[PDB]
C-alpha cells in the first residue's frame, strides 16, 4: 500500500495516514473541520462541513484522484438536526453522479466537532 | 464511475446514489425502512429490518449483483435492544458464507428509523 | 467469496463471518475485547485494545494477509477520554505506512466494552 501525504490537509499525527492507495482505490481517513494549519474550525454545520469537504478534496487530489472519483462516503454527525445543513454543503462538492453514502449521528466525534467524513474513491 | 438507479427501492432522500459500481464492487448506500414509494415503514425492529433487507436486495439486483455477492455490511441501529430481532431477519436474507460485518448502536439515524444498513458486494 | 474462520480469534456468534476474502481484499468484521475462547477482557483501554488488535491480527493472518496489509480501519470508542490510550496501543500494531482511519465515540458498546474495530486489508 502507498500512503498519501499533503500539507493541504491536517497533518497525520499518529498511527494513520491521510489516505492510502491500494487495490485501485483510495481510502481516505475520516476528515474533521481542522484547517491545514491545525486550527479547529468551529461554528455551525455549514462552516464545519465546508472545511471537511476541503480536506477531503485536498487529500483526494494528492492521491491523484478527486471528488468526482469518490464512490462511497461514510458520514458521522453529532446532531441529527445538522443533517439539512450538512447535505447542503455536501452537495456543493459532490455532484451527480453522487457517491454511495451512509450517514448516522453519534455521541461524539474527535475534538468535539459536528461532523466527520471518510471516503473511498477510485485511484488514477 | 457507474451509478445504479431503480424504482424497486426507495429513491435517494439526499445527495447520494442508491449504489455505485466501481472497481469490481458495488457500493450500496445505507438503506433505511422506506418502501419503494418513499413511505416510511414503522414498527418493531423485525418489521423495519425486513424493509431494509428488501431494499438492499432490490438495489443489488439492479446493479447486476445479489445478496449472495455481498462481502461486507455496515449496520447501524438506534437501540442496542433491537440487536436480536435485527439479527433474526438479517439471517433470512444473508446465508453462509455470510458477509463480514460491523453492527453498532448509535444515537440517531435518518428519518429517525431503527436501522440503517449499507454494504459492499462483488459486481459479479 | 471465501469466508475466513479461525479459532485464534473469538468465534463469530451470529450471521456473519470473522472475515471475507474477495476482490483482492479482506473484509474483517468488528472485533471487541474477547479472547479466543470467548472470555471477556476488561480493564483499561490499553488492555482491552490489545485484545482487539490481537483479534484483528489473528483473523487477518488466517485470511493469508496481515496487519501491514491493512488499508482502512473503522474504530468505535465508548469514552472519548480513552482515545489517547487506544491510539497508543493501536500504534504498537502498525508501522508506516499506516491505515486510513475513521474514529467515533458512541454511548455504549456490547457488554460494556471500551472499544471495537473493523477493517479492510489487501489480500496480498
mmCIF file of N, CA and C in Angstrom, chain B:
data_model
loop_
_atom_site.group_PDB
_atom_site.id
_atom_site.type_symbol
_atom_site.label_atom_id
_atom_site.label_comp_id
_atom_site.label_asym_id
_atom_site.label_seq_id
_atom_site.Cartn_x
_atom_site.Cartn_y
_atom_site.Cartn_z
ATOM 1 N N UNK B 1 -17.259 6.877 -12.636
ATOM 2 C CA UNK B 1 -17.901 5.649 -12.052
ATOM 3 C C UNK B 1 -19.180 5.238 -12.792
ATOM 4 N N UNK B 2 -19.993 4.396 -12.153
ATOM 5 C CA UNK B 2 -21.252 3.932 -12.743
ATOM 6 C C UNK B 2 -22.382 3.881 -11.711
ATOM 7 N N UNK B 3 -23.329 4.806 -11.836
ATOM 8 C CA UNK B 3 -24.455 4.892 -10.914
ATOM 9 C C UNK B 3 -25.530 3.832 -11.148
ATOM 10 N N UNK B 4 -26.183 3.432 -10.061
ATOM 11 C CA UNK B 4 -27.251 2.440 -10.098
ATOM 12 C C UNK B 4 -28.537 3.121 -9.648
ATOM 13 N N UNK B 5 -29.575 3.029 -10.473
ATOM 14 C CA UNK B 5 -30.853 3.639 -10.146
ATOM 15 C C UNK B 5 -31.987 2.654 -10.428
ATOM 16 N N UNK B 6 -32.882 2.487 -9.458
ATOM 17 C CA UNK B 6 -34.012 1.575 -9.602
ATOM 18 C C UNK B 6 -35.241 2.066 -8.844
ATOM 19 N N UNK B 7 -36.419 1.834 -9.414
ATOM 20 C CA UNK B 7 -37.655 2.252 -8.769
ATOM 21 C C UNK B 7 -38.199 1.139 -7.879
ATOM 22 N N UNK B 8 -37.453 0.044 -7.785
ATOM 23 C CA UNK B 8 -37.867 -1.085 -6.960
ATOM 24 C C UNK B 8 -37.403 -0.913 -5.518
ATOM 25 N N UNK B 9 -36.667 0.167 -5.276
ATOM 26 C CA UNK B 9 -36.180 0.506 -3.947
ATOM 27 C C UNK B 9 -36.478 1.994 -3.791
ATOM 28 N N UNK B 10 -36.615 2.478 -2.551
ATOM 29 C CA UNK B 10 -36.902 3.902 -2.382
ATOM 30 C C UNK B 10 -35.854 4.800 -3.034
ATOM 31 N N UNK B 11 -36.309 5.900 -3.621
ATOM 32 C CA UNK B 11 -35.399 6.840 -4.262
ATOM 33 C C UNK B 11 -34.529 7.481 -3.185
ATOM 34 N N UNK B 12 -33.348 7.949 -3.572
ATOM 35 C CA UNK B 12 -32.432 8.584 -2.629
ATOM 36 C C UNK B 12 -33.052 9.832 -1.994
ATOM 37 N N UNK B 13 -32.964 9.934 -0.668
ATOM 38 C CA UNK B 13 -33.513 11.082 0.057
ATOM 39 C C UNK B 13 -32.414 12.077 0.420
ATOM 40 N N UNK B 14 -31.449 12.230 -0.481
ATOM 41 C CA UNK B 14 -30.348 13.146 -0.252
ATOM 42 C C UNK B 14 -29.371 13.125 -1.413
ATOM 43 N N UNK B 15 -28.262 13.873 -1.327
ATOM 44 C CA UNK B 15 -27.281 13.896 -2.413
ATOM 45 C C UNK B 15 -26.435 12.625 -2.467
ATOM 46 N N UNK B 16 -27.060 11.522 -2.862
ATOM 47 C CA UNK B 16 -26.356 10.255 -2.962
ATOM 48 C C UNK B 16 -27.089 9.318 -3.908
ATOM 49 N N UNK B 17 -26.366 8.334 -4.431
ATOM 50 C CA UNK B 17 -26.949 7.359 -5.342
ATOM 51 C C UNK B 17 -27.285 6.106 -4.541
ATOM 52 N N UNK B 18 -28.277 5.347 -4.993
ATOM 53 C CA UNK B 18 -28.654 4.124 -4.289
ATOM 54 C C UNK B 18 -27.445 3.201 -4.188
ATOM 55 N N UNK B 19 -26.674 3.126 -5.269
ATOM 56 C CA UNK B 19 -25.469 2.311 -5.304
ATOM 57 C C UNK B 19 -24.568 2.787 -6.430
ATOM 58 N N UNK B 20 -23.289 2.444 -6.330
ATOM 59 C CA UNK B 20 -22.310 2.814 -7.338
ATOM 60 C C UNK B 20 -21.465 1.589 -7.653
ATOM 61 N N UNK B 21 -21.302 1.305 -8.940
ATOM 62 C CA UNK B 21 -20.489 0.174 -9.354
ATOM 63 C C UNK B 21 -19.120 0.710 -9.746
ATOM 64 N N UNK B 22 -18.074 0.146 -9.157
ATOM 65 C CA UNK B 22 -16.723 0.584 -9.468
ATOM 66 C C UNK B 22 -15.665 -0.374 -8.942
ATOM 67 N N UNK B 23 -14.607 -0.551 -9.725
ATOM 68 C CA UNK B 23 -13.515 -1.419 -9.325
ATOM 69 C C UNK B 23 -13.856 -2.863 -9.016
ATOM 70 N N UNK B 24 -14.942 -3.370 -9.593
ATOM 71 C CA UNK B 24 -15.320 -4.753 -9.357
ATOM 72 C C UNK B 24 -16.263 -4.937 -8.185
ATOM 73 N N UNK B 25 -16.638 -3.827 -7.560
ATOM 74 C CA UNK B 25 -17.545 -3.869 -6.426
ATOM 75 C C UNK B 25 -18.766 -3.003 -6.672
ATOM 76 N N UNK B 26 -19.762 -3.204 -5.823
ATOM 77 C CA UNK B 26 -20.976 -2.418 -5.850
ATOM 78 C C UNK B 26 -21.049 -1.829 -4.446
ATOM 79 N N UNK B 27 -21.044 -0.506 -4.365
ATOM 80 C CA UNK B 27 -21.119 0.183 -3.082
ATOM 81 C C UNK B 27 -22.560 0.633 -2.929
ATOM 82 N N UNK B 28 -23.240 0.062 -1.942
ATOM 83 C CA UNK B 28 -24.640 0.368 -1.702
ATOM 84 C C UNK B 28 -24.820 1.318 -0.528
ATOM 85 N N UNK B 29 -25.583 2.376 -0.765
ATOM 86 C CA UNK B 29 -25.853 3.369 0.266
ATOM 87 C C UNK B 29 -26.588 2.741 1.438
ATOM 88 N N UNK B 30 -26.523 3.405 2.585
ATOM 89 C CA UNK B 30 -27.215 2.899 3.752
ATOM 90 C C UNK B 30 -28.706 2.877 3.480
ATOM 91 N N UNK B 31 -29.293 1.688 3.524
ATOM 92 C CA UNK B 31 -30.721 1.554 3.281
ATOM 93 C C UNK B 31 -31.483 1.665 4.586
ATOM 94 N N UNK B 32 -32.621 2.345 4.532
ATOM 95 C CA UNK B 32 -33.456 2.518 5.709
ATOM 96 C C UNK B 32 -34.842 1.964 5.407
ATOM 97 N N UNK B 33 -35.678 1.794 6.440
ATOM 98 C CA UNK B 33 -37.026 1.254 6.232
ATOM 99 C C UNK B 33 -38.038 2.131 5.501
ATOM 100 N N UNK B 34 -37.754 2.410 4.234
ATOM 101 C CA UNK B 34 -38.658 3.189 3.397
ATOM 102 C C UNK B 34 -39.151 2.245 2.316
ATOM 103 N N UNK B 35 -40.431 2.336 1.971
ATOM 104 C CA UNK B 35 -40.978 1.488 0.918
ATOM 105 C C UNK B 35 -40.565 2.117 -0.406
ATOM 106 N N UNK B 36 -40.658 1.361 -1.510
ATOM 107 C CA UNK B 36 -40.275 1.910 -2.811
ATOM 108 C C UNK B 36 -40.910 3.265 -3.127
ATOM 109 N N UNK B 37 -42.146 3.475 -2.681
ATOM 110 C CA UNK B 37 -42.821 4.740 -2.952
ATOM 111 C C UNK B 37 -42.363 5.877 -2.040
ATOM 112 N N UNK B 38 -41.383 5.594 -1.185
ATOM 113 C CA UNK B 38 -40.864 6.619 -0.296
ATOM 114 C C UNK B 38 -41.557 6.727 1.048
ATOM 115 N N UNK B 39 -42.596 5.924 1.259
ATOM 116 C CA UNK B 39 -43.331 5.953 2.518
ATOM 117 C C UNK B 39 -42.566 5.220 3.615
ATOM 118 N N UNK B 40 -42.651 5.743 4.830
ATOM 119 C CA UNK B 40 -41.951 5.149 5.958
ATOM 120 C C UNK B 40 -42.599 3.851 6.433
ATOM 121 N N UNK B 41 -41.768 2.876 6.783
ATOM 122 C CA UNK B 41 -42.274 1.611 7.295
ATOM 123 C C UNK B 41 -42.005 1.610 8.796
ATOM 124 N N UNK B 42 -43.047 1.874 9.578
ATOM 125 C CA UNK B 42 -42.937 1.907 11.028
ATOM 126 C C UNK B 42 -43.131 0.514 11.604
ATOM 127 N N UNK B 43 -42.783 0.352 12.875
ATOM 128 C CA UNK B 43 -42.934 -0.940 13.516
ATOM 129 C C UNK B 43 -41.700 -1.338 14.296
ATOM 130 N N UNK B 44 -41.680 -2.573 14.786
ATOM 131 C CA UNK B 44 -40.541 -3.046 15.554
ATOM 132 C C UNK B 44 -39.350 -3.295 14.647
ATOM 133 N N UNK B 45 -38.251 -3.727 15.246
ATOM 134 C CA UNK B 45 -37.028 -3.979 14.504
ATOM 135 C C UNK B 45 -37.156 -5.066 13.436
ATOM 136 N N UNK B 46 -37.965 -6.092 13.684
ATOM 137 C CA UNK B 46 -38.112 -7.151 12.688
ATOM 138 C C UNK B 46 -38.818 -6.625 11.440
ATOM 139 N N UNK B 47 -39.839 -5.798 11.638
ATOM 140 C CA UNK B 47 -40.570 -5.233 10.516
ATOM 141 C C UNK B 47 -39.711 -4.247 9.731
ATOM 142 N N UNK B 48 -39.009 -3.371 10.442
ATOM 143 C CA UNK B 48 -38.172 -2.390 9.770
ATOM 144 C C UNK B 48 -36.953 -3.028 9.111
ATOM 145 N N UNK B 49 -36.398 -4.071 9.723
ATOM 146 C CA UNK B 49 -35.230 -4.713 9.131
ATOM 147 C C UNK B 49 -35.620 -5.434 7.844
ATOM 148 N N UNK B 50 -36.812 -6.022 7.818
ATOM 149 C CA UNK B 50 -37.259 -6.707 6.614
ATOM 150 C C UNK B 50 -37.318 -5.714 5.454
ATOM 151 N N UNK B 51 -37.825 -4.515 5.726
ATOM 152 C CA UNK B 51 -37.916 -3.491 4.694
ATOM 153 C C UNK B 51 -36.517 -3.119 4.196
ATOM 154 N N UNK B 52 -35.568 -2.984 5.120
ATOM 155 C CA UNK B 52 -34.197 -2.644 4.753
ATOM 156 C C UNK B 52 -33.591 -3.751 3.898
ATOM 157 N N UNK B 53 -33.829 -5.001 4.285
ATOM 158 C CA UNK B 53 -33.301 -6.143 3.544
ATOM 159 C C UNK B 53 -33.853 -6.197 2.122
ATOM 160 N N UNK B 54 -35.150 -5.940 1.967
ATOM 161 C CA UNK B 54 -35.763 -5.953 0.640
ATOM 162 C C UNK B 54 -35.183 -4.822 -0.213
ATOM 163 N N UNK B 55 -34.899 -3.680 0.413
ATOM 164 C CA UNK B 55 -34.319 -2.551 -0.306
ATOM 165 C C UNK B 55 -32.908 -2.906 -0.774
ATOM 166 N N UNK B 56 -32.116 -3.502 0.117
ATOM 167 C CA UNK B 56 -30.760 -3.923 -0.232
ATOM 168 C C UNK B 56 -30.821 -4.895 -1.405
ATOM 169 N N UNK B 57 -31.687 -5.895 -1.284
ATOM 170 C CA UNK B 57 -31.838 -6.898 -2.331
ATOM 171 C C UNK B 57 -32.189 -6.257 -3.675
ATOM 172 N N UNK B 58 -33.140 -5.329 -3.669
ATOM 173 C CA UNK B 58 -33.555 -4.668 -4.901
ATOM 174 C C UNK B 58 -32.433 -3.859 -5.541
ATOM 175 N N UNK B 59 -31.692 -3.113 -4.728
ATOM 176 C CA UNK B 59 -30.598 -2.302 -5.245
ATOM 177 C C UNK B 59 -29.492 -3.188 -5.806
ATOM 178 N N UNK B 60 -29.172 -4.257 -5.087
ATOM 179 C CA UNK B 60 -28.134 -5.178 -5.525
ATOM 180 C C UNK B 60 -28.506 -5.832 -6.851
ATOM 181 N N UNK B 61 -29.756 -6.269 -6.975
ATOM 182 C CA UNK B 61 -30.202 -6.899 -8.215
ATOM 183 C C UNK B 61 -30.124 -5.915 -9.383
ATOM 184 N N UNK B 62 -30.496 -4.663 -9.130
ATOM 185 C CA UNK B 62 -30.464 -3.634 -10.165
ATOM 186 C C UNK B 62 -29.033 -3.365 -10.613
ATOM 187 N N UNK B 63 -28.080 -3.600 -9.715
ATOM 188 C CA UNK B 63 -26.673 -3.384 -10.024
ATOM 189 C C UNK B 63 -26.059 -4.592 -10.725
ATOM 190 N N UNK B 64 -26.858 -5.640 -10.915
ATOM 191 C CA UNK B 64 -26.361 -6.841 -11.562
ATOM 192 C C UNK B 64 -25.713 -7.780 -10.561
ATOM 193 N N UNK B 65 -25.923 -7.492 -9.279
ATOM 194 C CA UNK B 65 -25.366 -8.300 -8.203
ATOM 195 C C UNK B 65 -26.493 -9.006 -7.442
ATOM 196 N N UNK B 66 -26.241 -9.324 -6.177
ATOM 197 C CA UNK B 66 -27.240 -10.004 -5.370
ATOM 198 C C UNK B 66 -26.770 -10.150 -3.936
ATOM 199 N N UNK B 67 -27.678 -10.543 -3.049
ATOM 200 C CA UNK B 67 -27.342 -10.707 -1.639
ATOM 201 C C UNK B 67 -26.193 -11.682 -1.395
ATOM 202 N N UNK B 68 -26.113 -12.739 -2.199
ATOM 203 C CA UNK B 68 -25.057 -13.734 -2.021
ATOM 204 C C UNK B 68 -23.681 -13.216 -2.431
ATOM 205 N N UNK B 69 -23.653 -12.056 -3.081
ATOM 206 C CA UNK B 69 -22.399 -11.453 -3.524
ATOM 207 C C UNK B 69 -21.909 -10.389 -2.546
ATOM 208 N N UNK B 70 -22.691 -10.126 -1.503
ATOM 209 C CA UNK B 70 -22.306 -9.127 -0.511
ATOM 210 C C UNK B 70 -21.151 -9.659 0.327
ATOM 211 N N UNK B 71 -20.087 -8.869 0.438
ATOM 212 C CA UNK B 71 -18.919 -9.287 1.201
ATOM 213 C C UNK B 71 -18.753 -8.529 2.509
ATOM 214 N N UNK B 72 -19.447 -7.404 2.640
ATOM 215 C CA UNK B 72 -19.333 -6.608 3.852
ATOM 216 C C UNK B 72 -20.573 -5.761 4.069
ATOM 217 N N UNK B 73 -21.055 -5.723 5.306
ATOM 218 C CA UNK B 73 -22.191 -4.875 5.629
ATOM 219 C C UNK B 73 -21.805 -4.003 6.813
ATOM 220 N N UNK B 74 -22.366 -2.806 6.838
ATOM 221 C CA UNK B 74 -22.127 -1.855 7.911
ATOM 222 C C UNK B 74 -23.518 -1.574 8.427
ATOM 223 N N UNK B 75 -23.798 -2.078 9.622
ATOM 224 C CA UNK B 75 -25.121 -1.955 10.209
ATOM 225 C C UNK B 75 -25.184 -1.040 11.411
ATOM 226 N N UNK B 76 -26.148 -0.125 11.388
ATOM 227 C CA UNK B 76 -26.341 0.806 12.488
ATOM 228 C C UNK B 76 -27.754 0.689 13.036
ATOM 229 N N UNK B 77 -27.867 0.639 14.358
ATOM 230 C CA UNK B 77 -29.172 0.554 14.998
ATOM 231 C C UNK B 77 -29.283 1.664 16.027
ATOM 232 N N UNK B 78 -30.482 2.206 16.183
ATOM 233 C CA UNK B 78 -30.679 3.281 17.143
ATOM 234 C C UNK B 78 -30.819 2.754 18.565
ATOM 235 N N UNK B 79 -31.115 1.465 18.697
ATOM 236 C CA UNK B 79 -31.316 0.854 20.009
ATOM 237 C C UNK B 79 -30.622 -0.506 20.121
ATOM 238 N N UNK B 80 -29.710 -0.625 21.081
ATOM 239 C CA UNK B 80 -28.977 -1.868 21.311
ATOM 240 C C UNK B 80 -29.933 -3.037 21.568
ATOM 241 N N UNK B 81 -31.093 -2.732 22.137
ATOM 242 C CA UNK B 81 -32.093 -3.751 22.443
ATOM 243 C C UNK B 81 -32.670 -4.394 21.190
ATOM 244 N N UNK B 82 -32.481 -3.745 20.046
ATOM 245 C CA UNK B 82 -33.004 -4.272 18.787
ATOM 246 C C UNK B 82 -32.086 -5.268 18.086
ATOM 247 N N UNK B 83 -30.898 -5.507 18.637
ATOM 248 C CA UNK B 83 -29.955 -6.433 18.009
ATOM 249 C C UNK B 83 -30.492 -7.844 17.739
ATOM 250 N N UNK B 84 -31.173 -8.463 18.716
ATOM 251 C CA UNK B 84 -31.689 -9.816 18.470
ATOM 252 C C UNK B 84 -32.642 -9.919 17.278
ATOM 253 N N UNK B 85 -33.631 -9.030 17.232
ATOM 254 C CA UNK B 85 -34.590 -9.045 16.142
ATOM 255 C C UNK B 85 -33.928 -8.734 14.814
ATOM 256 N N UNK B 86 -32.990 -7.797 14.838
ATOM 257 C CA UNK B 86 -32.265 -7.416 13.634
ATOM 258 C C UNK B 86 -31.528 -8.627 13.082
ATOM 259 N N UNK B 87 -30.793 -9.307 13.956
ATOM 260 C CA UNK B 87 -30.033 -10.483 13.557
ATOM 261 C C UNK B 87 -30.924 -11.570 12.967
ATOM 262 N N UNK B 88 -32.094 -11.783 13.563
ATOM 263 C CA UNK B 88 -33.004 -12.808 13.056
ATOM 264 C C UNK B 88 -33.399 -12.549 11.604
ATOM 265 N N UNK B 89 -33.879 -11.341 11.327
ATOM 266 C CA UNK B 89 -34.298 -11.004 9.975
ATOM 267 C C UNK B 89 -33.104 -10.984 9.026
ATOM 268 N N UNK B 90 -31.980 -10.463 9.506
ATOM 269 C CA UNK B 90 -30.754 -10.398 8.717
ATOM 270 C C UNK B 90 -30.412 -11.804 8.222
ATOM 271 N N UNK B 91 -30.564 -12.785 9.109
ATOM 272 C CA UNK B 91 -30.252 -14.178 8.797
ATOM 273 C C UNK B 91 -31.195 -14.822 7.783
ATOM 274 N N UNK B 92 -32.287 -14.143 7.450
ATOM 275 C CA UNK B 92 -33.236 -14.674 6.474
ATOM 276 C C UNK B 92 -32.807 -14.291 5.060
ATOM 277 N N UNK B 93 -31.993 -13.245 4.955
ATOM 278 C CA UNK B 93 -31.535 -12.761 3.657
ATOM 279 C C UNK B 93 -30.079 -13.086 3.351
ATOM 280 N N UNK B 94 -29.252 -13.147 4.387
ATOM 281 C CA UNK B 94 -27.845 -13.468 4.205
ATOM 282 C C UNK B 94 -27.590 -14.855 4.765
ATOM 283 N N UNK B 95 -27.023 -15.717 3.929
ATOM 284 C CA UNK B 95 -26.717 -17.093 4.297
ATOM 285 C C UNK B 95 -25.230 -17.378 4.081
ATOM 286 N N UNK B 96 -24.682 -18.388 4.776
ATOM 287 C CA UNK B 96 -23.262 -18.723 4.622
ATOM 288 C C UNK B 96 -22.885 -18.981 3.163
ATOM 289 N N UNK B 97 -21.743 -18.436 2.717
ATOM 290 C CA UNK B 97 -20.834 -17.612 3.519
ATOM 291 C C UNK B 97 -21.424 -16.228 3.783
ATOM 292 N N UNK B 98 -21.477 -15.844 5.056
ATOM 293 C CA UNK B 98 -22.020 -14.550 5.457
ATOM 294 C C UNK B 98 -21.042 -13.414 5.169
ATOM 295 N N UNK B 99 -21.556 -12.183 5.033
ATOM 296 C CA UNK B 99 -20.662 -11.053 4.773
ATOM 297 C C UNK B 99 -19.887 -10.751 6.057
ATOM 298 N N UNK B 100 -18.790 -10.012 5.933
ATOM 299 C CA UNK B 100 -18.042 -9.578 7.108
ATOM 300 C C UNK B 100 -18.998 -8.494 7.611
ATOM 301 N N UNK B 101 -19.009 -8.202 8.906
ATOM 302 C CA UNK B 101 -19.972 -7.229 9.401
ATOM 303 C C UNK B 101 -19.546 -6.427 10.619
ATOM 304 N N UNK B 102 -20.064 -5.206 10.687
ATOM 305 C CA UNK B 102 -19.848 -4.314 11.817
ATOM 306 C C UNK B 102 -21.267 -3.871 12.178
ATOM 307 N N UNK B 103 -21.688 -4.147 13.411
ATOM 308 C CA UNK B 103 -23.028 -3.792 13.875
ATOM 309 C C UNK B 103 -22.867 -2.936 15.118
ATOM 310 N N UNK B 104 -23.271 -1.675 15.022
ATOM 311 C CA UNK B 104 -23.114 -0.750 16.133
ATOM 312 C C UNK B 104 -24.369 0.065 16.439
ATOM 313 N N UNK B 105 -24.633 0.264 17.725
ATOM 314 C CA UNK B 105 -25.776 1.057 18.156
ATOM 315 C C UNK B 105 -25.338 2.516 18.202
ATOM 316 N N UNK B 106 -26.125 3.388 17.582
ATOM 317 C CA UNK B 106 -25.804 4.810 17.545
ATOM 318 C C UNK B 106 -26.935 5.682 18.074
ATOM 319 N N UNK B 107 -26.697 6.990 18.109
ATOM 320 C CA UNK B 107 -27.680 7.923 18.640
ATOM 321 C C UNK B 107 -28.920 8.124 17.781
ATOM 322 N N UNK B 108 -28.720 8.388 16.497
ATOM 323 C CA UNK B 108 -29.856 8.613 15.617
ATOM 324 C C UNK B 108 -29.549 8.274 14.171
ATOM 325 N N UNK B 109 -30.598 7.921 13.440
ATOM 326 C CA UNK B 109 -30.479 7.560 12.038
ATOM 327 C C UNK B 109 -31.392 8.450 11.201
ATOM 328 N N UNK B 110 -31.185 8.470 9.875
ATOM 329 C CA UNK B 110 -32.033 9.302 9.014
ATOM 330 C C UNK B 110 -33.508 8.956 9.223
ATOM 331 N N UNK B 111 -34.361 9.976 9.220
ATOM 332 C CA UNK B 111 -35.799 9.788 9.400
ATOM 333 C C UNK B 111 -36.162 9.134 10.736
ATOM 334 N N UNK B 112 -35.202 9.082 11.659
ATOM 335 C CA UNK B 112 -35.443 8.503 12.972
ATOM 336 C C UNK B 112 -35.778 7.022 12.990
ATOM 337 N N UNK B 113 -35.326 6.304 11.968
ATOM 338 C CA UNK B 113 -35.598 4.877 11.859
ATOM 339 C C UNK B 113 -34.807 4.047 12.862
ATOM 340 N N UNK B 114 -35.156 2.769 12.972
ATOM 341 C CA UNK B 114 -34.475 1.871 13.901
ATOM 342 C C UNK B 114 -33.194 1.270 13.354
ATOM 343 N N UNK B 115 -33.078 1.219 12.032
ATOM 344 C CA UNK B 115 -31.931 0.567 11.423
ATOM 345 C C UNK B 115 -31.531 1.113 10.058
ATOM 346 N N UNK B 116 -30.224 1.104 9.804
ATOM 347 C CA UNK B 116 -29.655 1.539 8.531
ATOM 348 C C UNK B 116 -28.572 0.525 8.186
ATOM 349 N N UNK B 117 -28.605 -0.006 6.970
ATOM 350 C CA UNK B 117 -27.597 -0.981 6.561
ATOM 351 C C UNK B 117 -27.038 -0.637 5.193
ATOM 352 N N UNK B 118 -25.725 -0.419 5.142
ATOM 353 C CA UNK B 118 -25.037 -0.136 3.882
ATOM 354 C C UNK B 118 -24.213 -1.384 3.611
ATOM 355 N N UNK B 119 -23.727 -1.547 2.387
ATOM 356 C CA UNK B 119 -22.924 -2.729 2.103
ATOM 357 C C UNK B 119 -22.029 -2.602 0.883
ATOM 358 N N UNK B 120 -21.135 -3.572 0.754
ATOM 359 C CA UNK B 120 -20.236 -3.647 -0.383
ATOM 360 C C UNK B 120 -20.404 -5.067 -0.892
ATOM 361 N N UNK B 121 -20.560 -5.206 -2.204
ATOM 362 C CA UNK B 121 -20.750 -6.508 -2.823
ATOM 363 C C UNK B 121 -19.877 -6.635 -4.060
ATOM 364 N N UNK B 122 -19.668 -7.867 -4.511
ATOM 365 C CA UNK B 122 -18.889 -8.096 -5.717
ATOM 366 C C UNK B 122 -19.818 -7.767 -6.878
ATOM 367 N N UNK B 123 -19.285 -7.104 -7.896
ATOM 368 C CA UNK B 123 -20.078 -6.726 -9.057
ATOM 369 C C UNK B 123 -20.556 -7.964 -9.809
ATOM 370 N N UNK B 124 -19.768 -9.031 -9.746
ATOM 371 C CA UNK B 124 -20.123 -10.271 -10.419
ATOM 372 C C UNK B 124 -20.239 -11.415 -9.421
#
